[PDB]
Design a protein around this ligand. Structure first.
Ligand SMILES: CC(C)CCC[C@@H](C)[C@H]1CC[C@H]2[C@@H]3CC=C4C[C@@H](OC(=O)CCC(=O)O)CC[C@]4(C)[C@H]3CC[C@]12C
Ligand SMILES: CC(C)CCC[C@@H](C)[C@H]1CC[C@H]2[C@@H]3CC=C4C[C@@H](OC(=O)CCC(=O)O)CC[C@]4(C)[C@H]3CC[C@]12C
Ligand SMILES: CC(C)CCC[C@@H](C)[C@H]1CC[C@H]2[C@@H]3CC=C4C[C@@H](OC(=O)CCC(=O)O)CC[C@]4(C)[C@H]3CC[C@]12C
Ligand SMILES: CC(C)CCC[C@@H](C)[C@H]1CC[C@H]2[C@@H]3CC=C4C[C@@H](OC(=O)CCC(=O)O)CC[C@]4(C)[C@H]3CC[C@]12C
Lengths: 414, 85, 49, 50, 109, 34, 49
């Protein structure tokens, strides 16, 4: 009745009705107004958004968000908290309205805003992240579960959109996948999905294909491994055209050697050579004066220490979470004990002790190589099981140890 | 049983991306790169996007149309025709 | 069509016009309109873009 | 028709209108080849069979 | 030759639904075994350095560094780190064996 | 003298066979269960 | 033969779209052949063999 051709609509003075419908949680009426009417971008203003964030924002949700910040602070959560604080007191008003709708759990309104949003998939991933981190907070199970369900729904919607887009176009889809942030969250779609742990999005054929292509770099994909290895061992040969390329000899060789696959193979070969040199030096070394190969081993150990320092800087405290990184670092520091002991020409006991330190450190280096082999072979469906199983085993081992002591204690007394 | 397929793919993603993020210089000479970065760490310290976004919006519109028609096509009964009759 | 400046963006009409534009693109046809920014021709221009 | 709300309706209606226009006018279906070609171009199976 | 006969027997008995598992499992086991071997050498290497410090013969060094640990199995402050590394190596080998044992189960559809 | 290397190789081969036989016997029923 | 050709083409991966469509078509043809051959086997024994 009201919306008809006969009743001409100016579509300029409808702002108040839109505001009233928006606040009263009327999604269908909002969609009807957006069908033929104002522009959402033009209507939104700083004063209106501030009023929405201040007067009509429930205190319960604000307390929940404060608890989330205090307990589960995240890179996106701190930004959204800053935005909320600023508005409560490249503007991207649409993103702010979408976040406001999400926080109060207006499913239909959030859906409409997302449909009207310029950037959808990134916004969907960010909404999934925010809703999941809010669901982690548990003051009442009702909202904690509703937010998680909405996050899952948004995640699957984004998955469907991205797979359809990937089916549509290849290069443009890959380019969009890595689009830089426009101040929405400070990160792209891929990292945002990683932080929220979106298994469905990552477990997608297109993302896996893109990751494989990156893991090959500019070297031709599906060029077969044995050809790559033969070319790596015989450097001039790749110039002969044995290995194809995705799309100039210097460029060819630079691309071939910059491929992370070839880099990993070269690193493994160099590590094997270093271990062989370590074995040779172990049985051949002069206590009074070390020879050149010992100095070469020292230089290689210094390079490994530099790499370990780089890993520390890149990763942080989470680096030590894995027991094997801790073991590698401990062994690298342990080698320095033998280095120090070798510094003394006299005190033959100290010299022998340092030799023993080197001797024992060789074994742990071998174990590290064994671990890289095991991880490389089982990089498939089994991998998770492996790692999980691994940790379990260690606990039992630890348990066993804490029993032996007691037995030994008793044995001593006996 | 439902989520085994995606979990291992997620783990493969995490390991591959983590390794790729690291520098891809041959190990023996990797040190050189770091040294260079150190200089950059000390000496220095001391339209098309709109087109891509419009294309993505077009695909979003197509997906919305598809999901909307899916519900309509789901029903195997044409109650509108019966009401018209 | 859409002589009046006010046009209804009903889903049925939008789908019909999108199908018409797709058909024209398939055959590489010529679409004749008035050229006014306001009204149904705005939808035609947006779909062409 | 208002009732028809399925996909691929505009093409069918346009093809039917063009076929109707070509039926009475011009050669008046004097040569089957032209009508068959016109109907094949727009992929209207039911009219071609009928 | 006896082992070859044993293999033909094993294949003949398990020519059924289990067969694929068997073969798959088999290959997994061998890898672990190979892995075990490439550990012994290192241990032997270390053991050599601990025990026979003075040795300047290519063939004697080769033999002692290869098949001393195998003979050992056939037959001050070091203790704590030695047991720690023993535990670490046992962890790795045990997880490898266990993975080889359940290897086929996850892949089965 | 030279026996040690081939002897250990054959020991590994035989151990492989026996271990796979035992493991197959351990999971034998699981596959057949419906 | 169509199943074989489509599968070996799907092994090649320059674009996932065609690589997957060919594999799906190969599976469809394979199951169609399976149905035809089982029906024929049910019909006659010696001629089918
Ligand atoms: C000279 C020293 C040799 C030991 C080098 C020269 C050529 C190399 C080989 C060239 C090609 C291959 C196949 C290659 O197999 C793969 O490409 C991996 C397959 C996969 O895991 O999927 C493994 C190593 C091998 C034997 C390379 C191992 C070491 C070889 C024999
Ligand atoms: C006596 C020496 C010179 C023999 C070793 C020759 C190299 C060619 C070997 C040593 C380590 C091997 C690599 C260990 C790890 C990997 C990665 C692997 O692919 C992966 O990274 C994970 C996926 C998978 O293959 O399972 C393929 C084989 C490759 C290059 C292996 C194949 C050949 C390498 C480089
Ligand atoms: C106090 C000193 C003398 C003992 C240090 C030896 C460690 C090897 C012990 C001490 C505490 C133990 C840990 C206590 C808690 C855990 C976590 C447990 O796994 C979990 O509970 C969940 C972890 C996850 O899955 O993320 C496995 C063993 C571990 C590391 C235990 C194994 C061995 C640890 C690290
Ligand atoms: C370099 C020399 C001194 C060592 C030769 C001893 C071999 C017994 C070692 C060397 C390389 C090893 C292999 C490297 C790669 C593989 C494939 C691996 O299985 C797979 O990765 C997939 C194969 C498939 O399923 O088809 C199992 C172990 C095997 C044969 C490894 C087991 C034992 C091998 C053959």
């Amino acid at each position: 009745e009201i919306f008809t051709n006969d009743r001409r609509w100016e579509s300029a003075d409808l702002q108040e009705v839109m505001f009233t419908a928006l606040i009263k949680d009327r999604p269908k009426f909002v969609r009807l107004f957006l069908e033929n009417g104002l522009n959402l971008q033009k209507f939104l203003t700083n004063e209106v958004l501030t009023e929405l964030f201040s007067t009509h924002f429930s205190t319960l949700v604000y307390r929940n968000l404060q608890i989330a910040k205090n307990s589960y602070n995240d890179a996106l959560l701190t930004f959204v908290w800053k935005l909320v604080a600023n508005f409560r007191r490249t503007r991207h008003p649409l993103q702010a309205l979408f976040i406001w709708a999400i926080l109060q759990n207006k499913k239909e309104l959030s859906k409409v805003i997302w449909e009207q949003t310029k950037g959808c998939t990134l916004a969907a991933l960010g909404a999934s992240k925010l809703l999941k981190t809010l669901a982690k907070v548990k003051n009442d199970i009702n909202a904690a579960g509703e937010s998680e369900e909405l996050a899952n729904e948004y995640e699957t919607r984004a998955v469907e959109l991205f797979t359809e887009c990937y089916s549509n176009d290849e290069d443009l889809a890959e380019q969009l996948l890595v689009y830089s942030c426009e101040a929405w969250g400070g990160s792209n779609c891929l990292e945002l999905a990683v932080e929220a742990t979106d298994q469905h999005f990552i477990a997608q054929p297109g993302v896996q294909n893109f990751l494989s292509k990156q893991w090959y770099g500019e070297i031709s994909r599906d060029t077969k491994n044995w050809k790559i290895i033969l070319c790596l061992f015989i450097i001039p040969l790749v110039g002969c055209g044995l290995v194809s390329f995705r799309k100039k000899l210097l460029w060819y060789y630079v691309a071939f050697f910059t491929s992370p696959f070839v880099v990993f193979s070269w690193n493994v070969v160099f590590y094997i050579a270093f271990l062989l040199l370590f074995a040779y030096v172990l049985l051949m070394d002069f206590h009074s004066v070390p020879h050149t190969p010992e100095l070469i081993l020292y230089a290689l150990v210094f390079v490994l220490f530099c790499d370990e320092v780089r890993q520390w800087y890149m990763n942080g405290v989470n680096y030590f979470t894995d027991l094997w990184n801790v073991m590698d670092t401990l062994g690298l520091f342990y080698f320095i004990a033998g280095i120090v002991f070798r510094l003394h020409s006299s005190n033959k006991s100290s010299l022998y002790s340092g030799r023993v330190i080197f001797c024992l450190d060789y074994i742990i280096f071998t174990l590290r190589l064994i671990h890289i082999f095991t991880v490389s072979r089982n990089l498939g469906p089994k991998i998770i099981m492996l790692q999980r199983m691994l940790i379990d085993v260690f606990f039992f081992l630890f348990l066993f140890a804490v029993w032996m002591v007691a037995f030994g204690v008793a044995r001593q007394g006996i | 049983q439902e989520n085994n397929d995606q979990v291992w793919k997620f783990q493969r993603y995490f390991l591959v991306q983590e390794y790729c993020n690291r520098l891809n210089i041959p190990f023996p000479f990797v040190v050189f790169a770091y040294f260079y970065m150190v200089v950059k760490k000390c000496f220095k310290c001391c339209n098309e996007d709109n087109e891509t976004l419009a294309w993505e919006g077009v695909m979003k519109e197509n997906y919305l149309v598809k999901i909307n028609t899916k519900a309509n096509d789901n029903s195997e009964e044409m109650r509108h025709r019966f009401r018209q009759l | 069509t859409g002589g009046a400046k006010n046009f209804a963006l009903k889903p049925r009409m939008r789908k019909i016009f999108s199908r018409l534009i797709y058909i024209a693109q398939s055959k590489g046809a010529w679409i004749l309109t008035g050229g006014t920014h306001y009204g149904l021709m705005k939808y035609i221009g947006e779909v062409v873009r | 028709k208002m009732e028809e709300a399925g996909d691929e309706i505009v093409s069918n209606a346009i093809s039917y209108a063009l076929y109707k226009a070509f039926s009475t006018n011009e050669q008046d279906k004097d040569n089957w080849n032209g009508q068959l070609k016109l109907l094949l171009e727009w992929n209207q199976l039911d009219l071609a069979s009928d | 030759f006896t082992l070859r006969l044993i293999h033909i027997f094993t294949v003949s008995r398990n020519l059924g639904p289990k067969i694929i598992m068997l073969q798959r499992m088999l290959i997994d086991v061998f890898f672990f075994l190979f892995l075990f071997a490439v550990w012994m050498v290192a241990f032997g290497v270390a053991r050599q350095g601990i025990l026979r410090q003075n040795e300047q013969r290519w063939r004697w060094i080769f033999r002692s560094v290869i098949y001393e640990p195998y003979l050992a199995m056939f037959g001050e402050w070091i203790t704590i780190p030695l047991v720690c590394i023993y535990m670490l190596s046992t962890n790795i080998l045990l997880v490898n064996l266990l993975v080889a044992m359940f290897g086929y189960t996850v892949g089965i559809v």
